[PDB]
Amino acid sequence: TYDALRRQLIPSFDLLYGSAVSVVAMSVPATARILDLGAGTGLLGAALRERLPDAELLLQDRSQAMLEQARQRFADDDQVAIRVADHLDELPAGPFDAVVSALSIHHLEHQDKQDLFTRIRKILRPGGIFVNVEQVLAPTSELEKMYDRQHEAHVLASDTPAEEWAAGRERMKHDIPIDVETQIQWLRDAGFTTADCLAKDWRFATYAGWNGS
Amino acid sequence: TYDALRRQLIPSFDLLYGSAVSVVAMSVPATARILDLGAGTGLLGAALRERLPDAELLLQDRSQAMLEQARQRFADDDQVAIRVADHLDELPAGPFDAVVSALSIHHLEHQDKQDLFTRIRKILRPGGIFVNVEQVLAPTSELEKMYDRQHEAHVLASDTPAEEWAAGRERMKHDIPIDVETQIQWLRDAGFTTADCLAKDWRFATYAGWNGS
Ligand SMILES: Nc1ncnc2c1ncn2[C@@H]1O[C@H](CSCC[C@H](N)C(=O)O)[C@@H](O)[C@H]1O
Ligand SMILES: Nc1ncnc2c1ncn2[C@@H]1O[C@H](CSCC[C@H](N)C(=O)O)[C@@H](O)[C@H]1O
């Protein structure tokens, strides 16, 4: 039921999640070591495992309640660990072929977003990839209003239980998002050699950066 | 026939054309004057008319055989004119509230792309909007290969008659695409106050610029 509600709250869910799965599957070996930052119930891990049965996934998140949902989903998988940690805590050593994230880093202050991309590159092997599926701000307040009408169109066409869209609205007034080109530039500053926006549906986008390639 | 085959050849058709319709509908009045550049059989114009029944449409294209198809689709539509004209020819005076384009400007050399953006802004009213649904090149040759596997992934999942993808591959030898951020910078250079990439699916992207807003 949780899986259906995310599809309802996020436009072009398949396109954007899928694009994170595909860019990782064309960047990394079948036996890659992957870190999922703020994995929550571990949906992005799920999509990755569906593509890459032989990959070793570390799921990390500050919320023990969210990771117990992840643990449930991955009950009978041997190649899946869990790590209780804040994004601002020392990252695991790795190294990792891939670090992936969905809808988490927009909860950090801008400066801590720049400090995280630099620390993520340190635990990435050469040729490794960083993939973010992210809530982005429009570049002007006029466009932000258009972004909002488009997100709200998708939610209502999806027949979202109102109680759940009202909650959605409230979680969103603590968010600290930014335009997708500011974030992508920060990848370049942190030293990723190549950074690109792969797919986008107004307020949501999949971007990636590569360490060497 | 034709309409189904475009859905087959073009990932995220509904998202990409749809985002062109929706950014125009939130940018211009119901009675806006719209120019469709390289309108072809005039599928973008159709989408726009479905959304804006009181808008005045001018469909322009160098190919008279394409515009014959457009004339057929708009047989019974009184607010629809046609203009046979090259992108390099003097644009109609207008003014227009919107100038829209789908899968045409990528056929120009890069400097004639920059020159067209500049001439297009001159025929737009203040606060008018330029929208391009476009074939874009990745920023690296390695990513270009990935964009190509994603476009080829959709075509085969869409059960495309091979004879038609064959043709597709050849027409693509005369294409002069460039990455989406270069093009969007050129809107800013040509004097649009705001430019943004709305939606994207690897090799296809919807972007826009605003003349004053
Ligand atoms: N500073 C921080 N450090 C670690 N995790 C954080 C965090 N701020 C938020 N989170 C976690 O980030 C998650 C964002 S919700 C999205 C979760 C999941 N990846 C999905 O896409 O469906 C939550 O589980 C939340 O607990
Ligand atoms: N230099 C040019 N001037 C005008 N139209 C051009 C052009 N180069 C290509 N075109 C036109 O651009 C079209 C490319 S196909 C895209 C057709 C239509 N816009 C759609 O959404 O499907 C063809 O109709 C072709 O004649």
Numbering used by the authors:
A (entry chain A), B (entry chain B): 17 to 229
Sentences copied from the publication:
Employing techniques such as crystallography, computational analysis, mutagenesis, and activity assays, we identified a His-His-Asp (HHD) motif in the active sites of the two enzymes, which is crucial for binding a catalytically active calcium ion.
Notably, the N-terminally truncated CysGΔN16 variant was active with metal ions available but inactive in the presence of EDTA. Thus, we conclude that the divalent metal ion is crucial for the catalytic function of CysG rather than for structural stability.
